[PDB]
Design a protein around this ligand. Sequence first.
Ligand SMILES: [Ca+2]
Ligand SMILES: [Ca+2]
Ligand SMILES: [Ca+2]
Ligand SMILES: [Zn+2]
Ligand SMILES: [Zn+2]
Length: 227
Amino acid sequence: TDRQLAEEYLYRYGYTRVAEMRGESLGPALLLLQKQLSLPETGELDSATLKAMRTPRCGVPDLGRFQTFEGDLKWHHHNITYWIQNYSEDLPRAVIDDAFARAFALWSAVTPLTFTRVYSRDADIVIQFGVAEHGDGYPFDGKDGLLAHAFPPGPGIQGDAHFDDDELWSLGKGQGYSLFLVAAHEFGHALGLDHSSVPEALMYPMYRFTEGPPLHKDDVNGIRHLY
Ligand SMILES: [Ca+2]
Ligand SMILES: [Ca+2]
Ligand SMILES: [Ca+2]
Ligand SMILES: [Zn+2]
Ligand SMILES: [Zn+2]
């Protein structure tokens, strides 16, 4: 099943598709993954690569996209609105509200965007907690594995951010995953950022708890090179 995990991972995150497009066994796809995740480029299902595959992470693909999306995948207005459609029961509602507010506050300081909480589906960014299949055909996977996902700027589902409520949500101390950190990362996608290959960057796909400021140069330059 180590081969099972590797196959599913390489497929889910887009490595197998790219390997096919290059006329190429797991080796070539592992190599692409190793390059993408900044692991040693051995092309082998080795210990570092298996460990990486076992690490909880964002459900957004690394190469390619969930699907074909509408538009150019950046916002064309400045006041982005968001709606917290539902709540996890893991944290008080006020703490969840504030986690999301603080996550947006990270991006607002480094972009010409502002973020405004609203209370309707008309919001640019709809935020949902869900489990397994939760209405968008990209089902969550139960405890651990993928923690959340989001969709690039645009109409409808685009711009939305979903969190897997089969995870224990906390602020990352003690037990559970930091909703603040995961939200900060997902909002990045919701603004049009892709994954970073820099392991310390906020937009690196793997979950990494830290008490330090979440943004790194790579995240700031990424958003600068967009807006
Ligand atoms: Ca999960
Ligand atoms: Ca939306
Ligand atoms: Ca939960
Ligand atoms: Zn992501
Ligand atoms: Zn979803």
